[PDB]
């Protein structure tokens, strides 16, 4: 099965947003399609569901009047419309599907989620720097290198090493927020015989403001 | 609203052992399910209506119970099962999730490796400087780092981030960063990132010379 | 109620009545259930067709047998007779089988509640029902219907045979004394068909009356125990036994006001019978003689058959407006009592249908007095003709 | 079908048949509805009791008047008669009123859906309905029921009068020609009883049969337009026209198979009639004259009356097991076809009740043949007796 949630989305306080979840591999006449919200406090909540065969819905009474769920069996899809966004609607929203007729196999399958960020500041572009070891440190059997990206907004940022060809010995830390800026780093540990014998570089891409910058970690 | 209370909210184990968790309802449910969320991924059933195992998952996961008290048992926890386990009741039409019990895997002690990286050349042009020190592959999760300038203590203006527990060797990591302008960076000579940990009673120190290079 | 059948048509019927009353008073309200104290009568009753072997019923079977046994034994000793086995015990068995069929009705009533609750769940939350449950519901319903079929067939066989024994009994009595009875006009006609018509009609009406009383008595306690979920009647507000009071008033008052507004009809029917018979006799002379045709007198007799026999066709709209109004309003008066309760959402689909079915069954089994009109036209005529045909 | 009434019992019934069929074919399929194109036939029909004056019905009323008028004129000029007005127009009006009452039935059926849908909404959410809506629903239903009551009462009055006019017509004919007819034995019985019994039984059977056929034709298209919701039947699977095929098969095979398992019965009934008459006639002789009693002879006659009167009570269980099985399965066969469709959640409470009621009304209007034994027992005896009573 495949459910393909929309992309990330930043919005302005007070506006409204519409989200979509397309299902390929089954016929949504056989299932529910509910939605679930996960605030950064990792607790999960329930929002509402819908039966596409006749078109009934049911909502969590706390959430009634805020967000409505509609479907369209022509092209397999469901949509959720949240209105009057406030400072407390930073979350992640997951669709799903529950079998109700034709039971067999995994009876529940969750999409991928669409981060939603609501605030007032504007966008920004990243600034990447290489990291090199100090002089005289090449007496060991293995070396570590790093790549630093600083001062961007908003999430997310995808970072890769040698276009994904270097997938062993790499650690990447979660981002932190500091005065409307974010920061994250990375580390690569390789055998001392590999460097600087073989070229190495960190590949970073930021789709929000269309940045794609590559820098090579040139030895001092 | 059926209020599900779930405990213990923290757990620990070692490979080869056995563990239990309990999701006690607040009235008759008859309908429950158990999930499993790994870091940065979406959840996934294990048990449907509290007995029927879902499609192919390792046979060590099973649970049972009826009425208003249920249990989940993991036969032989191993290195691949650091997660967070939820429970979902279903017999109403609002539906209520649970609390989640982060599960850990123990291992023998390990000591970190420390590296220091001075401000980069292109960082020099930017009008600001940055210094960072990395910590890799250590257990357990409690650690503290220290910043000293020319042997003078300096504390504020720091940012830190811990990685989640690795999924093949059960270790950790940590990052420390100290960002200063050009003026104060040029005024000093020796920098040091220092940390202490249960592995050894002796502090681990890494340093470098501004003047040499 | 003749002399050859039914040992003594005098004290027999009175003795039977007072003995029935004594037995009922002992069991129902005087606390007969304490026999259920001696034995382990659990008192809880299933819903399938396994209902009819639990001790809760089997005790009642034994007690009915004992009462009829004692009553029949006394009369076997006091006043012997020839058709005594048919006359006593056959009547006993017909009463008992009628009660049994009423019990089957009650069982299907109690079954409509879980089925409709299931359908409501299947419509409101489809992930909770799987089709095998529907199939098991149909299974238990057929389990009951089978027993209903078998008992009904056997009972009809027996009733027909008992009636024919009544016929042969009074035939032997009359034909034994033919010679004194020889010279009354039309002996052959009487002793040829009036016996059967009288016996058959009396049987049918007796069974229908007992049926009505047993349906009412069997269904009142259900309404008493089920009137706790309907606190408020539509307009009058709150009344301690609103449901039972409303049911009793509607049914009994409907029949009472229906059979008092059409009271003039029997006289007119009898008058029409008499004038037609006079025409018959007047024509009979004209069949063998010559000077009896008399077209003038035949014209006058026909005009008497005409003018008189339109009054019946006219004093019949009065009885047909009332019957139709009642029988139509009843289609929604049963559900009119559950509007405030439905709006407040207290009853569930399944106590709606069980109550609607209670009212429907009481009404449909009280259909006799609109079709038991026979007791006003022929059976009276047959009894009077056949008694006056007996000196 | 006599010579006094119904102008010519020969070509007349063929003429009525061919004209009825031609008119039906022109209207139904030949697209006579282009009269609806001449006028502003909206084609949308309300559910209130303002249904019966919109142009769609009014065109039909005018068309029916035109057809009957033409067919009446042709026989008013081809060959006159004395009771032509009754014999033609009375029968036309009786047929029309039967059709009208069928239409009232369809109207109530179409009303069932919104009411129960409103109840389902009210039960599932106490926060959407208020009592005024329920009062309005009952309002429209009573609006229709009033017109049903008025029509039914007037119709009963008229049919009874028309039957009496038939009786007086054949009585006039038979008494006009008495002298030749005088000498046939038992003529008084004939002219006094056979005419009335004949007329009444004929009327009843004819109207019942036409009602059955009209119900079937009236309810097929509703089933066609409503079977778009029930694609898959439970066991066979998917059939293009599941509901219509299932309904027709159940109803027509039910009746056909029920009246072939009970085919021997009229022969037994006739034999019983013969032996009864023989016993009666023997008893008449011994009334008036010398002994003629002969107890051995009466014993022989009664044993013949008996042994041949038990065989009817035994070749008659076969016919009650089948009838009760059919009648008791029917209560849940209507709802057995909607298990997979309920599960698939396409039909809602209110489209289920329409279907249950369609099946129930068709069954309740196809009950005649269980009560049609009279026309296979007494009507042929009367016809044979009364025709044989004519030279």
Descriptive overview:
The complex is a heterotetramer, with one copy of chain A (220 residues), one copy of chain B (213 residues) and two copies of chain C (391 residues). With 220 residues, chain A is an all-beta fold. Chain A folds into two domains: 2-118, Immunoglobulins (Immunoglobulin-like), CATH 2.60.40; 127-216, Immunoglobulins (Immunoglobulin-like). Helices cover 0% and strands 43% of the residues of chain A. Chain A has strands at 2-5, 9-11, 17-24, 35-38, 44-51, 56-59, 67-71, 77-82, 93-95, 116-118, 127-131, 142-152, 158-161, 170-172, 176-177, 182-184, 186-191, 201-206, 211-216. In chain A, strands 11, 12, 14, 15, 16 and 17 form a six-stranded antiparallel β-sheet that branches. A four-stranded antiparallel β-sheet of chain A has the order 1-3-8-7, with no helix packed on it. In chain A, a hairpin with a 5-residue loop joins β4 (35-38) and β5. The termini of chain A are far apart. In chain B, strands 1-2-7-6 form a four-stranded antiparallel β-sheet, with no helix packed on it. Chain B has a four-stranded antiparallel β-sheet with strand order 5-4-3-9, with no helix packed on it. In chain B, strands 11-12-16-15 form a four-stranded antiparallel β-sheet. Chain B has two domains: 1-106, Immunoglobulin-like, CATH 2.60.40; 113-209, Immunoglobulins (Immunoglobulin-like). Chain B has helices at residues 121-125, 182-186, and strands spanning 5-7, 19-24, 32-34, 47-48, 52-53, 61-65, 70-74, 84-85, 87-89, 101-102, 113-117, 128-136, 144-149, 152-153, 158-162, 173-181, 190-197, 200-209. Chain B is mainly beta and 213 residues long. Helices cover 5% and strands 41% of the residues of chain B. Chain C has a domain at 268-314. Chain C contains 15 helices and two strands. The longest helix of chain C is centred in the middle third of the chain and has 46 residues, at 131-176. Chains in contact: A-B, A-C, A-D, C-D. The interface between A and D is small, with 4 and 5 residues. Chains C, D: Keywords: Cell inner membrane, Cell membrane, Membrane, Peptide transport, Protein transport, Transmembrane, Transmembrane helix, Transport. Chains C, D: Residues 1-11, 78-87, 159-205, 264-331 are periplasmic. Chains C, D: Belongs to the peptide uptake permease (PUP) (TC 9.A.18) family. Chains C, D: GO terms for molecular function: ATP binding; microcin transmembrane transporter activity; peptide transmembrane transporter activity; protein homodimerization activity; secondary active transmembrane transporter activity. Chains C, D: InterPro entries: ABC1_TM_sf, ABC_transporter_sub-D, SbmA_BacA.
């Amino acid at each position: 099965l495949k459910l393909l949630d929309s992309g990330a989305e930043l919005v302005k306080p007070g506006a409204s947003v519409k989200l979509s979840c397309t299902a390929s591999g089954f016929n949504i006449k056989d299932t529910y399609m509910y939605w679930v919200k996960q605030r950064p406090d990792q607790g999960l909540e329930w929002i509402g569901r819908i039966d596409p065969a006749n078109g009934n819905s049911k909502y969590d009474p706390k959430f009634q009047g805020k967000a409505t769920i509609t479907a369209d069996t022509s092209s397999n899809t469901a949509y959720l419309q949240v209105s009057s966004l406030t400072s407390e609607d930073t979350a992640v929203y997951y669709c799903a599907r529950w079998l109700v007729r034709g039971r067999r196999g995994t009876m529940d399958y969750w999409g991928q989620g669409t981060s939603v960020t609501v605030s007032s500041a504007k966008t920004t572009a990243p600034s990447v720097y290489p990291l090199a070891p100090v002089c005289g440190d090449t007496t060991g059997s293995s070396v570590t290198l790093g790549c630093l990206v600083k001062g961007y907004f908003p999430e997310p940022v995808t970072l890769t090493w040698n276009s994904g060809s270097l997938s062993s010995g790499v650690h990447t830390f979660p981002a932190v927020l500091q005065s409307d800026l974010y920061t994250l780093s990375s580390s690569v540990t390789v055998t001392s015989s590999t460097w600087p014998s073989q070229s190495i570089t960190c590949n970073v891409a930021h789709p929000a403001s269309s940045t794609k910058v590559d820098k090579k970690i040139e030895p001092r | 609203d059926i209020v599900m209370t779930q405990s213990p909210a923290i757990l620990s184990a070692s490979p080869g052992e056995k563990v239990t968790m309990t999701c006690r309802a607040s009235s008759s449910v008859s309908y429950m399910h158990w999930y499993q969320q790994k870091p940065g991924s979406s959840p996934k059933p294990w048990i449907y209506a509290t007995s029927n195992l879902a499609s192919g998952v390792p046979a060590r996961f099973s649970g049972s119970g009826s009425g208003t008290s249920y249990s989940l048992t993991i036969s032989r926890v191993e290195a691949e099962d650091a997660a967070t386990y939820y429970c979902q009741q279903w017999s109403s039409n609002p539906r209520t999730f649970g609390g989640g019990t982060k599960l850990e895997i123990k291992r023998a002690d390990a000591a970190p490796t420390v590296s220091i990286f001075p401000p980069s050349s292109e960082q020099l042009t930017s009008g600001g400087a940055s210094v960072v020190c990395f910590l890799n592959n250590f257990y357990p999760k409690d650690i503290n780092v220290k910043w000293k300038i020319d042997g003078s203590e300096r504390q504020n203006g720091v940012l830190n981030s811990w990685t989640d527990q690795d999924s093949k060797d059960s270790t950790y990591s940590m990052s420390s960063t100290l960002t200063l302008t050009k003026d104060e960076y040029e005024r000093h000579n020796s920098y040091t990132c220092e940390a202490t940990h249960k592995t050894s009673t002796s502090p681990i120190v890494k340093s470098f010379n501004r003047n040499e290079c | 109620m003749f002399k050859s059948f039914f040992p003594k048509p005098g004290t027999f019927f009175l003795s039977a009545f007072v003995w029935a009353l004594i037995a009922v008073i002992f069991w129902q309200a005087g606390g007969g259930d304490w026999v259920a104290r001696i034995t382990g009568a659990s008192g809880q009753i299933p819903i399938s067709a396994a209902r009819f072997w639990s001790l809760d019923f089997l005790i009642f079977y034994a007690y009915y047998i004992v009462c009829v046994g004692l009553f029949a034994l006394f009369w076997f000793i006091y006043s012997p007779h020839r058709w005594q086995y048919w006359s006593i015990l056959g009547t006993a068995l017909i009463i008992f089988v009628t009660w049994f069929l009423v019990e089957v009705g009650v069982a299907v009533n109690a079954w409509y509640a879980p089925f409709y609750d299931l359908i409501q769940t299947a419509l409101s939350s489809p992930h909770k029902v799987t089709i095998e449950q529907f199939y098991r519901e149909v299974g238990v319903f057929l389990g009951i219907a089978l027993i209903a079929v078998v008992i009904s067939v056997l009972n009809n066989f027996f009733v027909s045979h008992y009636v024919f024994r009544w016929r042969t009994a009074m035939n032997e009595y009359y034909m034994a004394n033919w010679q004194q009875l020889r010279h009354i006009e039309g002996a052959a006609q009487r002793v040829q068909e009036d016996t059967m018509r009288f016996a058959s009609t009396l049987e049918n009406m007796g069974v229908s009356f007992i049926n009505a009383i047993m349906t009412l008595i069997a269904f009142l306690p259900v309404l008493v125990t089920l009137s706790a979920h309907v606190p408020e009647l539509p307009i009058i507000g709150h009344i301690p036994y609103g449901l039972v009071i409303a049911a009793i008033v509607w049914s009994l008052m409907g029949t009472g006001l229906l059979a008092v507004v059409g009271i003039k009809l029997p006289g007119l029917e009898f008058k029409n019978q008499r004038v037609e018979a006079a025409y018959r006799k007047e024509l009979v002379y004209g069949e063998d003689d010559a000077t009896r045709a008399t077209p003038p007198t035949v014209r006058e007799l026909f005009s008497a058959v005409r003018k008189n026999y339109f009054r019946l066709y006219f004093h019949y709209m009065y009885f047909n407006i009332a019957r139709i109004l009642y029988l139509q309003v009843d289609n929604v008066f049963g559900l009119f009592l559950l509007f405030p309760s439905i709006v407040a959402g207290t009853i569930t689909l399944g106590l709606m249908t069980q109550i609607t079915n209670v009212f429907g069954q009481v009404r449909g089994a009280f259909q006799y007095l609109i079709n038991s009109w026979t007791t006003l036209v022929e059976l009276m005529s047959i009894y009077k003709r056949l008694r006056s045909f007996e000196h």
